[PDB]
Amino acid sequence: DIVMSQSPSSLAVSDGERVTLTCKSSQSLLYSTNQKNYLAWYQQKPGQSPKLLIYWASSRESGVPDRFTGSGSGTDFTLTISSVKAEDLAVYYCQQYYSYPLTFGAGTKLELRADAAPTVSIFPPSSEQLTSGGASVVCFLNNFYPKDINVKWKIDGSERQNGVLNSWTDQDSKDSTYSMSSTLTLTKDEYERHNSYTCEATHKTSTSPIVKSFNRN
Amino acid sequence: DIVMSQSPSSLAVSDGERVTLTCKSSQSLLYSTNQKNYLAWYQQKPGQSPKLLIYWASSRESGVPDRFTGSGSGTDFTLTISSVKAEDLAVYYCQQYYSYPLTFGAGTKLELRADAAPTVSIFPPSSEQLTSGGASVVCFLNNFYPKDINVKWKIDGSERQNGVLNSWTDQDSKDSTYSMSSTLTLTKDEYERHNSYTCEATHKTSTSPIVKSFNRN
Amino acid sequence: EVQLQQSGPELVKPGASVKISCKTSGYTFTEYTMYWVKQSHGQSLEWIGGINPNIDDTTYNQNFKDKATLTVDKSSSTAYMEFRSLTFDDSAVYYCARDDKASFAFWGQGTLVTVSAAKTTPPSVYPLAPGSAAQTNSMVTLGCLVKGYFPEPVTVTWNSGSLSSGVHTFPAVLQSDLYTLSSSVTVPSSTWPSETVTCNVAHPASSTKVDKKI
Amino acid sequence: EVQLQQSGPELVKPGASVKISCKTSGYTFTEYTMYWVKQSHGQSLEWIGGINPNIDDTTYNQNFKDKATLTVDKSSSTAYMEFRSLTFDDSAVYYCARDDKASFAFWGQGTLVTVSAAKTTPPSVYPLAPGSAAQTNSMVTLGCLVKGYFPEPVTVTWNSGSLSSGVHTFPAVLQSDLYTLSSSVTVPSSTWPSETVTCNVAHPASSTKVDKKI
């Protein structure tokens, strides 16, 4: 079949800056008789349905604001936005009408800016958890940026990937930042056989990881 | 004057069947030369104004759907509906224009189907009721069919007919059922002289009456 | 095609006189006669009378003798109806029906006229809860009584209108010149009594809003 | 424009069948063409297939072969999409794509189909409190754990929804056919531990609401 690619996967833009998207296919989508390149540009608002914007890459659909200007022909394509607004935060897609099956893009999600410094907050397992037959050691990572961050779990100096779950939500509109929760589950027998529980996270802006620990006694 | 009668009073109908209404007059409403009969059929929607359906008993109003027709002359009168709809719920009337004073009909109403019954609605009185000097015990009837029911009040095994407040509602638009509330009020020192309060209700589909009671102390 | 306008609800004391008006527009008032019909007990209708504007033809029912008198206004194109010696049985919905031809007639929206010797009072509501410690039903029904209010209507919602299902509004009954109503709403057994529900009643006449948490 | 009326959310089990209806209005149903799009892992759209209701032509993708069928109804102007032999990878959000003009394609509200084998269970709330007596930071964090609930979602409020500031609600994760979420808030050192708060959760499916003090 025919495959398409979008690069890059994500872009962080501020208010007033222009943004350009690129959709490259595996072969020329140009049709000779109609002399029109068949491609579709979508914008999907969060919690809503996607909608078409630029049809046949050469024109703007009626009702779409002037900031959306389509261009490109043959292989390469470009979606140019003159000035972004507060309602321009969404994910974009790229569809081809050339041949079946219809190929869909990987998607590109916009972000905001900038400079969010995270922190580590540790909590011990509760009293009702150990009664139920298990234990959970979690530390919350909130107010950070960008969305790319790595967290490690080391028990008594030994690194363990068993029971590691992460929870990553969308970007909060108030502080323009992200919050991620990490959950590590273990039974009541493993809680009594171990003492120190640590979670270690690495951030690009920080030259050294932030470590936090607590004791069972 | 010339009084008119209507039978039956109420009947339960389904969706898509035929409904026949009859209005009988004590005297002949016919006028000789024009071979016409004086009557007018009415349809009054709840919260709306009455409207006319069949004029001179033989013909349909302009704008009324074809499902409303009528036949008959002289004494008897017939109003037949070919196919009922969901908006057909109303109260129908028949008037005679023959002689003054103008006499009206008793009215008819259509119901739905079927088989709803309650179990225990009993609410004991609260502590704030006695602070005002009075006392009130209530029995409710919810999700029951048909509207015909006989509520009875038994205090310490004795029947009490005074202070009974009965209230009936319209038909529900969801389960097509009825709601009835019976309130019994009395004074403060009479409530302290009695302990057990039994609330009796008799329903048609049940071969035995439902007997429920509660105690004050 | 036509607009028949009347007055709104009136609050009158027994012994006074009330005037009901019927507005006519879109047609000549000097041609077609006007009639009046009384609606009693919510269903049965009663014929009041009729009047012809131009020839001053007035005929009244045997019940309305020395009670209902009709007067027409030729200048403003409207009809007037006034009553004398109002009693307790005189509270009914009134309509003014136009007579065009024998085939079809026009009706108005109606005027709600009630008469009682009464004074407006803030509604006194009390909570109600079942006195049994357990039950065999998976549903737990609650309710609250509304007593000592005037005049109609009274809007009763539940938890700021969050639960719109399972609500039943019972019509009011007239006792000692004051109406009393009640309401009941089904609630699951997995909530009560671990949370509290409130009864929100509104009385726009007295401008009183009270909430009782159960 | 066109009003696309779909069905509600469906909860089924792997191995059963499910029907998704798409209602069209305002134009001719037999003229234009119908399509369906599935959204996989929430950021990625997948093309299911398409059907022309005029000549009843049916085509599908390679992944959706021998799985979903497409039937149309001329009387009600509705499009039917039925699935057979469901798996755990078939749980996603489905879209009804109606192609009218090449300028803009009309889209519907979406259909959430969650296919899993599970039984409805009330949620379990585990409170969280820091174990340190003092800290240099003036802002202290609290947390609430909600485990063992189904189906999703559930509404989590802090102190009966009185505190709307600094509320971080994390999405649910799926473990052993059960869902688990976490929530954390920022509290100043003045009120903590001077005053006590609570974690209030509400589950609309099981009608079970649990309150715990922190």
Residue numbers in the entry:
A (entry chain d), B (entry chain b): 1 to 217
C (entry chain a), D (entry chain c): 1 to 214
Could you pull the original sentences from the published paper?
The ectodomain of the S protein consists of a receptor-binding subunit termed S1 and a membrane-fusion subunit termed S2.
(E and F) Side and top views of the S-S5D2-F3 cryo-EM map (E) and pseudo atomic model (F), with three up RBDs each bound with a S5D2 Fab. This is in line with the high potency of S5D2 on blocking the interaction between RBD and ACE2. The surface property alternation and side chain enlargement induced by the T478 K replacement in B.1.617.2 may break the interaction network with S5D2 Fab, leading to reduced S5D2 binding and increased resistance to neutralization by S5D2.
